[PDB]
């Protein structure tokens with residue numbers, strides 16, 4: 393299979409001190425979790441239980457993410473990435489790293505965000521809201537990509553939005569990884585519905601552009617109100633659903649560009665499909681959320697060829713966001 397490199401920020405980690413990306417050498421300092429009283433269960437992630445908590449030393453409201461089970465290398469990665477990204481635009485702020493003094497189980501402490509569940513929130517988003525929050529999410533992605541980091545789990549569940557204060561934070565960096573040119577990565581990342589085609593065809597030399605596919609999937613579901621937008625029942629069916637929209641010939645062109653041998657089971661299920669116009673998804677229930685600019689942006693995100701997808705920075709400059717950058721400057 394042919395090689396691939398990020399379009400932007402490709403060499404940024406090699407330009408930094410080795411200490412920056414050599415997370416296996418990062419040694420966290422573990423405080424005492426008894427400074428924090430757990431107050432409310434908020435939810436969970438793959439390897440965590442997340443609680444609202446009060447820091448009993450200063451009455452501040454925080455979030456405590458308890459890591460269980462525990463892979464040490466993966467904890468070092470999440471912690472180092474969070475420290476590298478601290479103070480980044482719309483990146484969740486890591487405040488502390490602590491351990492229960494009896495179980496020695498590790499926990500990450502974060503700033504509290506008063507999230508509206510996206511299933512309730514997406515029912516009330518306006519066209520302007522979608523442009524605003526997508527813009528804020530793109531700032532976080534441009535930031536973490538400029539810091540040599542792929543999130544690799546971009547999905548509504550990982551985008552906290554306080555709709556009252558109109559505040560956004562990208563969370564759960566436990567799958568995030570440092571980008572290094574020509575490195576082959578594990579493709580078993582992201583939720584099925586947000587996996588880019590590169591993951592679904594087992595192309596391991598991927599880069600920041602994976603997050604831009606996931607972001608296009610979110611944009612599609614918000615403006616069209618079909619959530620998730622590509623609703624596969626398994627990883628084979630996920631690629632078929634994508635191909636029923638972007639077309640099969642464009643899929644075969646991608647595979648030819650990168651010399652990707654396709655899992656032969658696909659021969660039974662892919663069929664042949666023409667590219668659908670994005671306008672075919674418009675109807676009376678989503679018409680108020682769709683515009684030519686939205687569709688043009690979506691078209692430049694949801695591309696098979698990861699190398700041709702917009703960068704986060706290019707997406708921020710797209711006319712779909714002019715109403716937001718006008719009322720923000």
Ligand SMILES: CC(C)=CCOc1cccc2c1-c1c(c3c(n1C(C)C)CCCC3=O)C2=O
Nearest residue numbers: 434435436437442455502504505506507563564
């Ligand atoms: C007030 C409500 C209803 C939610 C506020 O949820 C917050 C707020 C601030 C910071 C974080 C979370 C959160 C995190 C994480 C998770 N959640 C939530 C979605 C349970 C779950 C996945 C793993 C993870 O890392 C996380 O870092």
Ligand code: NA
Nearest residue numbers: 437438550564
């Ligand atoms: Na998560």
